[model samples]
Target: MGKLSEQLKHCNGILKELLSKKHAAYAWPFYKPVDASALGLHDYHDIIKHPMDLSTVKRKMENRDYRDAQEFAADVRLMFSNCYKYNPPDHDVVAMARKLQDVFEFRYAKMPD
Candidate 1:
């Protein structure tokens, strides 16, 4: 079986150390699940059908939900994807997402798999 034993430790460190604690641009907007009704983002529901957040990722990471580092990266990327889809190009949220992704991908590619 192709099990990623070190990948868990490697990927978990990515979340705890590299991304959140290092938080390149402080992705506070994506720290939690998107609350459309509370924020009055009526169009959010229609645009972002699949929502993802760091909080969700945290639980999944700790609970061993991610089968591999790739799955974890998928969720992280998915959160950014949803942001790009819902936010305008000039929006700061989109910019933050871009910055976070840049740092994430850079280290992600460099990780010792």
Candidate 2:
């Protein structure tokens, strides 16, 4: 359970949650720019959409420096925190963002060796 492996696990969890319908509303914004069509949403082919590239994610996890991974996780945390704040009055959105922030912070924990 080295840092890399733990971070990979955390990333896997994040991906799993992202696919869950529970966070559909909160997650849609993050994914909409990619490909709404794939999610069975409206077509965006005319908008030059690009689907998420899991291979690129794997490459980053394999090749990124430690500091870069930390910074990336930090950025994800910040984004969710901001989302929580921006969607005032929507408790579900706030809850979703909070859960996502927790998942993102999992990468920051000390990995078991």
Candidate 3:
């Protein structure tokens, strides 16, 4: 494969591994058991659960490969950005995700021609 393709594969692998290996505790605060009584949805307590599925996200990595460095970088950014829907900014996982995003951004910016 060419340089751009190699870079895309490496960057995508990094994110796939990160998401697949994330600890359950890292996801806890985002999906904590709700006090249904407080929201007057007592009957729905058993149904409330974490809305985001990291497994589904990981599965998306199966066919990912890019021909353009900038496009790959942008796609990775979007992947992490979407996590904010479930993970708050203050969460540790968010910080780690941002760090990984930066790593890819920096790496691709210096990719060999």
Model 2 misplaced stretches (Cα beyond 4 Å): 1-26, 33-67, 89-91, 107-113
Model with the higher lDDT, candidate 1 or 3? 1
Q: Model 1, range 1-113, lDDT digits (tens) per residue?
A: 24497777777877875445557455778778998999899889888878999889999987889888888999999998998887789988888888888878887887673
Candidate 2 or 1, higher lDDT: 1
Tens digit per residue, CA lDDT, model 3, 1-113 = 77767766765665554444353334433232334477585554254343323344344445553445565456555556555544569978687566655655665565556
Worst 10-residue stretch by lDDT in candidate 2?
47-56
lDDT of 1 at 51: 90
Candidate 1 local lDDT, residue 43: 86
Give candidate 2's TM-score. Answer: 0.42
How close is every model to the real structure, measured as TM-score? 0.88, 0.42, 0.43
Clashes of 3: 0
Error of 1 at 27 (Å): 1.7
Clashing pairs in 2: none
Q: Which lDDT value does model 3 have at 66? A: 45
Off by over 4 Å in 3: 1-65
